[PDB]
Amino acid sequence: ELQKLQWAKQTTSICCYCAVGCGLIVHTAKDGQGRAVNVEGDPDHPINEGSLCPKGASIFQLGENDQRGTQPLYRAPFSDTWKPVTWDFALTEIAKRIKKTRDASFTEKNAAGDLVNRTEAIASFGSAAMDNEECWAYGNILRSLGLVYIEHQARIXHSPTVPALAESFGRGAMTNHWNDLANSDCILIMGSNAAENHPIAFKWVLRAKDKGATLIHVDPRFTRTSARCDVYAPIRSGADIPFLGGLIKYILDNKLYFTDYVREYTNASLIVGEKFSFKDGLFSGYDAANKKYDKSMWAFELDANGVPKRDPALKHPRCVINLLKKHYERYNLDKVAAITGTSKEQLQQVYKAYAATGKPDKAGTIMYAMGWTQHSVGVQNIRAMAMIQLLLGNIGVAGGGVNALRGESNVQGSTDQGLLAHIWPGYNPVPNSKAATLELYNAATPQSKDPMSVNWWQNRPKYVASYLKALYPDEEPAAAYDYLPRIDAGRKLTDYFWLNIFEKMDKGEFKGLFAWGMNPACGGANANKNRKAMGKLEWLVNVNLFENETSSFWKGPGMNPAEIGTEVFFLPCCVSIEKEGSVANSGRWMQWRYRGPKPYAETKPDGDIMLDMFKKVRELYAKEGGAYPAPIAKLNIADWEEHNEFSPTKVAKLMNGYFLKDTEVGGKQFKKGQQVPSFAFLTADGSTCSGNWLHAGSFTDAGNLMARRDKTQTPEQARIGLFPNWSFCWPVNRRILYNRASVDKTGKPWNPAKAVIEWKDGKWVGDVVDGGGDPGTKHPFIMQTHGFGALYGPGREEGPFPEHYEPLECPVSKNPFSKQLHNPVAKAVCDPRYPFIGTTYRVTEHWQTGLMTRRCAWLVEAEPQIFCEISKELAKLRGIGNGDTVKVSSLRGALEAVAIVTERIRPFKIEGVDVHMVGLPWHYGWMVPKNGGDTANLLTPSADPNTGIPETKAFMVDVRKVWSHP
Amino acid sequence: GKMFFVDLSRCTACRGCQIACKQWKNLPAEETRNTGSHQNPPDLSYVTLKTVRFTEKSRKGPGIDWLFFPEQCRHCVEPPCKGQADVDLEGAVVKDETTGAVLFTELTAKVDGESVRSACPYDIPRIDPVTKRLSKCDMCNDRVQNGLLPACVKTCPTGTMNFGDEQEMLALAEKRLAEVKKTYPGAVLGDPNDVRVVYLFTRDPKDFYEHAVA
Numbered sequence A: 001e002l003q004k005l006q007w008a009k010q011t012t013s014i015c016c017y018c019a020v021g022c023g024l025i026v027h028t029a030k031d032g033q034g035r036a037v038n039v040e041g042d043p044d045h046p047i048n049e050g051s052l053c054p055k056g057a058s059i060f061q062l063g064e065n066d067q068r069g070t071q072p073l074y075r076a077p078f079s080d081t082w083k084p085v086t087w088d089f090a091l092t093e094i095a096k097r098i099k100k101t102r103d104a105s106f107t108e109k110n111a112a113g114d115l116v117n118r119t120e121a122i123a124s125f126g127s128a129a130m131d132n133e134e135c136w137a138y139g140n141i142l143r144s145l146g147l148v149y150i151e152h153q154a155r156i157x158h159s160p161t162v163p164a165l166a167e168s169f170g171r172g173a174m175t176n177h178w179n180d181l182a183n184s185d186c187i188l189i190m191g192s193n194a195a196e197n198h199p200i201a202f203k204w205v206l207r208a209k210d211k212g213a214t215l216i217h218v219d220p221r222f223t224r225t226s227a228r229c230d231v232y233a234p235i236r237s238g239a240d241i242p243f244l245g246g247l248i249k250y251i252l253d254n255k256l257y258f259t260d261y262v263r264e265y266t267n268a269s270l271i272v273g274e275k276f277s278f279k280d281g282l283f284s285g286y287d288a289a290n291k292k293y294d295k296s297m298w299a300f301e302l303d304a305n306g307v308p309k310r311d312p313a314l315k316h317p318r319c320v321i322n323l324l325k326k327h328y329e330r331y332n333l334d335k336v337a338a339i340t341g342t343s344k345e346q347l348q349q350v351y352k353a354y355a356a357t358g359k360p361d362k363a364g365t366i367m368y369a370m371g372w373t374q375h376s377v378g379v380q381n382i383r384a385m386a387m388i389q390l391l392l393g394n395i396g397v398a399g400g401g402v403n404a405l406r407g408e409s410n411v412q413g414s415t416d417q418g419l420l421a422h423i424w425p426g427y428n429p430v431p432n433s434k435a436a437t438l439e440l441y442n443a444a445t446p447q448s449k450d451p452m453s454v455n456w457w458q459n460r461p462k463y464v465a466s467y468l469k470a471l472y473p474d475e476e477p478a479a480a481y482d483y484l485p486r487i488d489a490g491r492k493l494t495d496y497f498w499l500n501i502f503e504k505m506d507k508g509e510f511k512g513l514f515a516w517g518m519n520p521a522c523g524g525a526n527a528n529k530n531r532k533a534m535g536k537l538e539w540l541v542n543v544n545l546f547e548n549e550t551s552s553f554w555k556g557p558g559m560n561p562a563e564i565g566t567e568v569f570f571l572p573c574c575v576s577i578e579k580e581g582s583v584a585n586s587g588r589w590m591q592w593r594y595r596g597p598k599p600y601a602e603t604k605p606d607g608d609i610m611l612d613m614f615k616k617v618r619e620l621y622a623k624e625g626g627a628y629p630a631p632i633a634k635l636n637i638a639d640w641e642e643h644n645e646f647s648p649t650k651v652a653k654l655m656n657g658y659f660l661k662d663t664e665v666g667g668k669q670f671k672k673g674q675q676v677p678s679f680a681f682l683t684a685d686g687s688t689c690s691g692n693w694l695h696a697g698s699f700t701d702a703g704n705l706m707a708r709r710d711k712t713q714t715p716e717q718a719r720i721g722l723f724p725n726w727s728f729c730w731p732v733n734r735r736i737l738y739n740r741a742s743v744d745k746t747g748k749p750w751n752p753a754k755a756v757i758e759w760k761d762g763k764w765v766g767d768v769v770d771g772g773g774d775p776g777t778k779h780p781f782i783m784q785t786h787g788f789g790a791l792y793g794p795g796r797e798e799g800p801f802p803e804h805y806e807p808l809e810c811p812v813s814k815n816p817f818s819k820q821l822h823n824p825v826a827k828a829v830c831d832p833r834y835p836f837i838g839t840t841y842r843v844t845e846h847w848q849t850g851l852m853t854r855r856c857a858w859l860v861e862a863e864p865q866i867f868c869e870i871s872k873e874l875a876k877l878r879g880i881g882n883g884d885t886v887k888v889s890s891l892r893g894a895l896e897a898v899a900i901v902t903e904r905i906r907p908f909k910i911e912g913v914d915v916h917m918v919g920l921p922w923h924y925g926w927m928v929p930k931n932g933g934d935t936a937n938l939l940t941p942s943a944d945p946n947t948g949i950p951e952t953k954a955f956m957v958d959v960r961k962v963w964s965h966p
Numbered sequence B: 001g002k003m004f005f006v007d008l009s010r011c012t013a014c015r016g017c018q019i020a021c022k023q024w025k026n027l028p029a030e031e032t033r034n035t036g037s038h039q040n041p042p043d044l045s046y047v048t049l050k051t052v053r054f055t056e057k058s059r060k061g062p063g064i065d066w067l068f069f070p071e072q073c074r075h076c077v078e079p080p081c082k083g084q085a086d087v088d089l090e091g092a093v094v095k096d097e098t099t100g101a102v103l104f105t106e107l108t109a110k111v112d113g114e115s116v117r118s119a120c121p122y123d124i125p126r127i128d129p130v131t132k133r134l135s136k137c138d139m140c141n142d143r144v145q146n147g148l149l150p151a152c153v154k155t156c157p158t159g160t161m162n163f164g165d166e167q168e169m170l171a172l173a174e175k176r177l178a179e180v181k182k183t184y185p186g187a188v189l190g191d192p193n194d195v196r197v198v199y200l201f202t203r204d205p206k207d208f209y210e211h212a213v214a
């Protein structure tokens, strides 16, 4: 026996940092009754096989940490000191701060007499860091209190990624999964530093290479990822659409696209209406005054049934494919090399390697995460990736996909639970004020007259009904429909989002903030303005692990606690290894983890904090009346608790769903009390509840499928590593999305050596088929209205084809592709005192604002202080030496950092001029550690109307040497 | 005897090995500051048995050659640290005959610290300024004898870290060297006859660190 682990109970867990979803083994002293003694990798987990990066490897130090919170801290208006206080107090006082603010601000009717039943005085940020069951409960709790201003982390990647991938494929999710990367023949890492930001991913990236894959990194900087790729191509910041457009041109010109895949499975053959055109950088239907498109000018020509017309010959000059060829002819190698900075020879090198995956026996994958996709045309960047993949037949196949890497451990799940302003759980929209009934709500769901188009969203009413029968199971859905708040149909949707929540706060338009598992005082762009804006709050509830820059903004740099009247509750939650629940990784793997040690001191699971905070409000309403008691009093919270505590097990069973009465569905009988086996057996009539239709199939009568730890694989399964018996993925354990596109019209795989599915003896064999139906009988994109992968995507604000509009404002004046310089649907000052492009990015050792990692002495050991990475050339121009203290400044602020001078950064040649990029990590903040430095968001601007997202990847700065004594 | 094969052609410098070593032994963190490098702690010490060293070397064409060196005791077949210690006291530095682990005991407090370090051709041994004991990597010998991989080997995601019987590890080192040479023609194994920690360098080992080989 190893002494350290003897008499310690062993439990499994899942990493509480990035979306790879690495397995842990936790050892807890006194056969479970004591503290953790050891945390390391789970050797049996199929993703990390025992591996951890330094963040995961240091979880022991995060958990067993005496800087952690012990109990609630109250800070009084104008006070300059915390006040240790009990839970029963803090919640009782918070319940009162909610009711008062709600009562005073509740509006039953908007300024048009439309029913809204909402509070606009309270806002909530968070959180991707909570369990799926805590995320689902939290969204329902906030909405029953009638909030609409509900946002978290997801917003920054959601806004670019989900619309681009949904327009293209019909879902917003990562198309494949981590293990599947090993099956790829060519891996294009572009807008990702995955060796640093998804490190276990490289286990599977390097196994791809072992079996002959070419690895390509396209990045402004040379990083730890670059050092282990076959090809490193530098790209100028924001030149991605030119680079990708050149690849589309190259693939089309050299007949490198996979014709049979393109003809059957994409909209290549659909006939666009004659109203469509593109001249001088503008699509038809442009409103020059309002800077917006009439998208009806982009509509397909329809047949006598309302189905889009098609030429299966691909000869009609208004075939999507011929318009695609015409559009990308401009993107020749010489102009793409000029604007990107990439050599003509490298462009040919990369284009030739990646385009070869067009062959059915080769697979290419594109990995991107955040990069610079947040700007106006970021959506078009990702659309271009989808279009390249659809041309090359890489969607639906092992080692293909658009691997849009999620950030946080449960950002997929937190999004799935609808902690964003515009969605309920399961991506059912939040009603607008014109959606006056449930009948009108369901009306919004487009229908298809095509018999081959599954158009699965036509099932929406069954899901919206089962969601309402989970929240209010004695009420009729149509009645229940009235309890939940609604947004203004008049108002621009982005007015409810992250960025406007910050502008509103600064104009004092909010009374109360929930910073639940987020650090806005560091994570918000333009931190000076945001720390100031928080002053204008009456009250602030912060739920986290440690005291932080958010909880304690009232004593931040330059602040007068006396002058500042904001009332602050700090509620300390327990770490991931101290609670039970599920997290949903980037591959949609919903993985169950267990308690090791009991919560440290008097910390609580988020589940118990929110449930107890709410039950106080429920109480206090039931004995003082007010506002609108219906939602609060009727919300079913019995199903959430067991033995006086939040029950992850019962919330997960509710989210899956159960039959509220005996029912017959899909030619089978089910009994009252029984679990729904898949979302196929949900109903609109009230026979079923389900908190989240995506979760229907995850916790059946057969048990908790999320908790499966079974490596059983068939030969065809093991060959591409589906691991279908390890945990569970939405939807219904489909591991690779769009997998019907992996086979021809008989159900033979295009690449049998790496089959995903195969029609064998009246069965689909391998992965779970993505859409039921005999071979050749259904279009393969079942969540699409028309059923195809969209090369031409008419729902996009900037046009149905990606087009280069310059996202760099200050140093660029010329667009070589059109007469339209900037985004025609889109104010930067460009002050000459700040001539350098500032950028922020991550390092392997730190997590987000650094709230978690700046408290872990081993990570601070490795990366103790804010740094500033600059070229040798810019070091020479400013006489900076390696290790010198430097002042970085912008119109928004200034800070000190240690210079790192390196050839890993090079000047961009922009219009005959050398333009310098200056790099900073955003992992630092004033609280801890001593001499760490402050947040890089001192330097960043607040913003524009398109996005609802900040800018953190390109902002104009100066850097000056700070002088020592000789 | 046991052996590590360390394929530095696969290292992402993720530094999971550096944290994993400290977590398994509950070693404290050093006081560190940035002096113009990601590298930290800047060197091995009494409380640091492994640090990843970073060196940037120019190459023609875009980018650099970034060299990563996860440094540790080489667990020499014939260790000169043992010879220099056996002068002042026997049993201070011992040899596990099952695994091959070279092990510093608490009797290193007795022997001459400086001289024992000077005799190491890899400059690995480190002395506590207070208790005058010597510390270094111990091959996680406790974990090895109970059938576990050393902390830094189990934690490594890339396939850089490998551990087992010296037979099949030498065989692998040769098989991998042949394959890596296709991409990195100057790829060589570090003193593969003399050590139990066999590094595959992608170029001149000295480029990684001055003491990378003896």
Ligand SMILES: Nc1nc2c(c(=O)[nH]1)N[C@H]1C(S)=C(S)[C@@H](COP(=O)(O)OP(=O)(O)OC[C@H]3O[C@@H](n4cnc5c(=O)[nH]c(N)nc54)[C@H](O)[C@@H]3O)O[C@H]1N2
Binding pocket: A018, A153, A157, A190, A191, A192, A193, A194, A196, A197, A198, A218, A219, A220, A221, A223, A235, A236, A237, A238, A239, A240, A368, A369, A370, A371, A372, A406, A407, A408, A840, A841, A842, A843, A844, A845, A846, A847, A848, A849, A953
């Ligand atoms: N270690 C660590 N890992 C993390 C996080 C963390 O804080 N620390 N955070 C997580 C979160 S919330 C997220 S969203 C993900 C994001 O993960 P990534 O997107 O990988 O994160 P970044 O390092 O911000 O940006 C990636 C790369 O984009 C490059 N880049 C910058 N501008 C451009 C451009 O115009 N074009 C292209 N092609 N590349 C460009 C940068 O040089 C950088 O190498 O990481 C997650 N993982």
Ligand SMILES: Nc1nc2c(c(=O)[nH]1)N[C@H]1C(S)=C(S)[C@@H](COP(=O)(O)OP(=O)(O)OC[C@H]3O[C@@H](n4cnc5c(=O)[nH]c(N)nc54)[C@H](O)[C@@H]3O)O[C@H]1N2
Binding pocket: A016, A127, A129, A130, A131, A153, A154, A156, A157, A370, A407, A516, A517, A518, A519, A520, A522, A523, A524, A525, A543, A544, A545, A546, A573, A574, A575, A576, A606, A840, A841, A847, A848, A849, A850, A851, A852, A922, A936, A937, A940, A952
């Ligand atoms: N300049 C600049 N700014 C950026 C970015 C950038 O690249 N550059 N990145 C942006 C991006 S992509 C993102 S996603 C945001 C992220 O911004 P934030 O979400 O504010 O970042 P953190 O709060 O540091 O990270 C997540 C939080 O989860 C908390 N947490 C962990 N476990 C639990 C738990 O069980 N319960 C609760 N309640 N909390 C828990 C951690 O303590 C931590 O505070 O930042 C954005 N801001």
Ligand code: SF4
Binding pocket: A015, A016, A017, A018, A019, A020, A021, A022, A048, A051, A052, A053, A054, A055, A056, A057, A198, A199, A200, A201
């Ligand atoms: S941070 Fe990501 S890669 Fe590292 S151990 Fe955790 S989940 Fe795995």
Ligand code: SF4
Binding pocket: B010, B011, B012, B013, B014, B015, B016, B017, B018, B052, B068, B070, B155, B156, B157, B158, B159, B160, B161
């Ligand atoms: S854990 Fe492996 S990949 Fe990471 S630095 Fe150590 S040897 Fe290199």
Ligand code: SF4
Binding pocket: B072, B073, B074, B075, B076, B079, B080, B081, B082, B102, B119, B120, B121, B122, B123, B124, B125, B136
């Ligand atoms: S590497 Fe140095 S300390 Fe380790 S066994 Fe060899 S001589 Fe002794």
Ligand code: SF4
Binding pocket: B020, B021, B022, B024, B049, B050, B072, B136, B137, B138, B139, B140, B150, B151, B152, B153
């Ligand atoms: S073998 Fe053990 S003691 Fe030696 S460096 Fe690796 S983890 Fe540390």
Ligand SMILES: [S]
Binding pocket: A128, A153, A154, A157, A406, A407, A408, A411
């Ligand atoms: S994220």
Ligand SMILES: [W+6]
Binding pocket: A153, A156, A157, A370, A407, A408
């Ligand atoms: W993110």
